[PDB]
Amino acid sequence: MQIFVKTLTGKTITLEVEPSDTIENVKAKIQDKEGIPPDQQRLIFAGKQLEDGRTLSDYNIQKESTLHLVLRLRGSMQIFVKTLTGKTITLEVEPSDTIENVKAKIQDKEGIPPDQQRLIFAGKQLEDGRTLSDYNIQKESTLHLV
């Protein structure tokens, strides 16, 4: 069975799915088609937000029926990456974003290798797996790099 996942720009993603599939599955599916990490994802059907564990059959969802994707991701966070050169790197972020993801942006933005990036906050080195949220980084917190 095909189903459709709609975004809030009306963009339609087609998936091949089975009744016995989970939402964890579908979110994971949507990650290839579209890159979106599952944590960001909500799926809505019949005005209900679907639970990861329960199956498509459970939600009485059918061939050619349409789910809606409503992401948790938000607008307006910025933070600062002070450097050895003096250079301040200003990063567009989401509290959700992992240190792992940051190292990665940082490489994106001005070309330094994460296996070499020593990210600090208030003197604490930074679990690539942990996130900004858990580290209690307010909008406009300033960080150091080594």
Partner: protein, 266 residues
């Protein structure tokens, strides 16, 4: 002081400054900008303080203010903050960044006044000159966001009620209130609106809400989405004939900045 809306910077020099790693992703950022830079000469760095969404939009809408839109011109708007508070008391659960009804009324009154100042302008140079000195400032600006957020909440109520009455509403609102943490206007407020300018920004579904609140269509270049349907994302998707339009840019859905038109230039 990290200014609200930085002066116009050549966009081509910008993507060059900011996208200087060797990464695959960076390329997509560069290409994103290249497209934009055909319509737009320059870019204005909006401050990334969790208000970026409202600041960007409202800066735009107001800088280009041609006439004062009627919704603002209506003076029942003044009496609306008292009304909502009377009816829905949980609105006292309101969480400021910078008694309570008076404060909001004052905030909204400010918005009406300031926006009319820019409409009654003669030149558009004058109009915009004027508008940067709004956002230069500290306290006045942040009041405007308490007004807008209010207007968002008003509208959220308005719509939720209509949905429940069986009445025809915008589909985004259906999904707005489908969220576990945003089932009803109360829930939205406690969990989403209050945290704006504190913990977090607007979700995309709430961009929708924003446009509705101020009756301006928001149109966004999302670089992340370059070479796809969504690259120029529009809130709302099927905007009204009349509603004026603001253009914003979002590298990766996490902050909003302002692309400057060729003719709108300083």
């Amino acid at each position: 002081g990290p200014l609200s809306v930085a002066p116009e910077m050549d966009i081509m020099d910008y993507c060059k400054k900011e996208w200087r790693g060797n990464t695959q992703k960076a390329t997509c950022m560069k290409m994103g900008y290249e497209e934009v830079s055909q319509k737009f000469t320059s870019i204005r760095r909006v401050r990334g303080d969790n208000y970026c969404a409202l600041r960007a939009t409202l800066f735009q809408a107001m800088s280009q203010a041609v006439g004062l839109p009627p919704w603002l011109q209506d003076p029942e708007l003044m009496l609306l903050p008292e009304k909502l508070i009377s009816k829905y008391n949980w609105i006292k659960q309101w969480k400021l960044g910078l008694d309570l009804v008076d404060k909001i009324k004052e905030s909204l009154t400010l918005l009406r006044k300031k926006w009319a100042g820019l409409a009654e302008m003669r030149t558009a140079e004058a109009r915009q000159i004027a508008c940067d000195e709004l956002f230069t400032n500290e306290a006045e600006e942040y009041s405007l966001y308490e007004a807008v957020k209010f207007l968002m909440l008003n509208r959220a109520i308005e719509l939720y009620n209509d949905k429940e009455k069986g009445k025809e509403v915008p589909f985004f609102s259906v999904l707005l209130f489908a969220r576990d943490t945003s089932n009803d206007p109360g829930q939205l407020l406690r969990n989403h609106l209050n945290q704006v300018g504190h913990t977090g920004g607007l979700e995309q579904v709430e961009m929708f809400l924003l446009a509705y609140a101020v009756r301006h269509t928001i149109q966004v270049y999302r670089l992340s989405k370059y070479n796809t349907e969504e690259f120029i994302t529009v809130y709302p998707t099927d905007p009204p004939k009349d509603w004026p339009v603001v253009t914003l840019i979002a590298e990766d859905d996490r902050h909003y900045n302002i692309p400057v038109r060729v003719c709108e230039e300083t």
